[PDB]
Design a protein around this ligand. Structure first.
Ligand code: OGA
Ligand code: MG
Ligand code: NI
Ligand code: ZN
Length: 331
């Protein structure tokens, strides 16, 4: 069995190997990469996403989100308070202001220590989930707006044609902006490219051990767990590496830098934080190996999770017994 300890693997594809996206995902899996829940892919030196980032300031962040924490430093939830619209140039200036800028630090480990000690005492503002892309149309390799669609994969594997679309999303971050513990919608893969700026630190639980994280979360967030049998789908709960280690939860960590891709694998729980002003692009995708995960994915039906249009068909076809309850939660 490849990668039996479920370590995060880092790949360096050649320019030739960077041509065929699906084939390379399957290669990484042949080496056991998926066992970790997360892999890093460093693009060949010949590749670029676009020519420059000098002209992005006029992008609008219609609904910046202030991420307000409640709890204790290592075990907390966050809620998202909506703020007035601002441009990426305005948001960049805000991120670099004295109130929001990254503190002085020695190295990534020192900054991680400071994040977990102090996160809850601040409310950073995140430009998340903005439909759009920063890949040049002429970038042919690993262009996240030109991937095969999940609807097409489902149709190829199972024969059923479905409605829906699959487009990328931009994320503008600042110091302490946080992504809560989650798997993807329908336990899909995700791919995330860090276009520019400061790093992103990731934590991940191997898919084979995801239920250990779920059981801890039910213990640590007992009101939330009574409210909803899949409350991690709400994407609000944080648990620190120290708390995970105290509770024996298997996990790994890695820091992504600008110019690097990360892939999350089906049912790989992940969480993390941004080091300073940055911009990432991410999208969900599927492979044949996903279908069994999609059929077994938990679902939130309490009303909180609310998701895209395109998840309807995935539930309807892969999980017909659950469909009527889930759709009520959507309505
Ligand atoms: O970068 C972020 O805030 C969160 N991204 C992801 O959870 C992802 O790419 O799957
Ligand atoms: Mg612009
Ligand atoms: Ni994710
Ligand atoms: Zn719920």
């Amino acid at each position: 069995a490849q990668n039996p300890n479920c370590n995060i693997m880092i790949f360096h594809p050649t320019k030739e190997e960077f041509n065929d996206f699906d084939k390379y995902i399957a290669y990484m899996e042949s080496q056991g990469a998926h066992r970790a829940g997360l892999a890093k892919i460093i693009p060949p030196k010949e590749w670029k996403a676009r020519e420059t980032y000098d002209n992005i300031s006029e992008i609008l962040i219609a609904t910046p989100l202030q991420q307000v924490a409640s709890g204790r430093a290592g075990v907390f939830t966050q809620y998202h308070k909506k703020k007035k619209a601002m441009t990426v140039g305005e948001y960049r200036h805000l991120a670099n202001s004295k109130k929001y800028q990254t503190p002085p630090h020695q190295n990534f480990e020192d900054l991680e220590r400071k994040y977990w000690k102090n996160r809850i005492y601040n409310s950073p503002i995140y430009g998340a989930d903005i439909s759009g892309s920063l890949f040049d149309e002429n970038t042919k390799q690993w262009n996240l707006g030109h991937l095969g669609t999940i609807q097409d994969l489902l149709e190829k594997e199972c024969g059923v044609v479905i409605e829906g679309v699959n487009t990328p999303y931009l994320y503008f971050g600042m110091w302490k902006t946080t992504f809560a513990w989650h798997t993807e919608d329908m336990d899909l893969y995700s791919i995330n490219y860090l276009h520019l700026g400061e790093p992103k630190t990731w934590y991940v639980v191997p898919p084979e051990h995801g239920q250990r994280l779920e059981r801890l979360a039910r213990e640590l967030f007992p009101g939330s767990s009574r409210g909803c049998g899949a409350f991690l789908r709400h994407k609000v709960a944080l648990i620190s590496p120290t708390v995970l280690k105290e509770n024996g939860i298997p996990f790994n960590r890695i820091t992504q830098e600008a110019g690097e891709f990360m892939v999350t694998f089906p049912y790989g729980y992940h969480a993390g934080f941004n080091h300073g002003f940055n911009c990432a692009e991410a999208i969900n995708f599927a492979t044949p190996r996903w279908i069994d995960y999609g059929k077994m994915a938990s679902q939130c039906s309490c009303g909180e999770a609310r998701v895209t249009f395109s998840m309807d068909a995935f539930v309807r076809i892969l999980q017909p017994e659950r469909y009527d309850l889930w759709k009520r939660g959507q309505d």
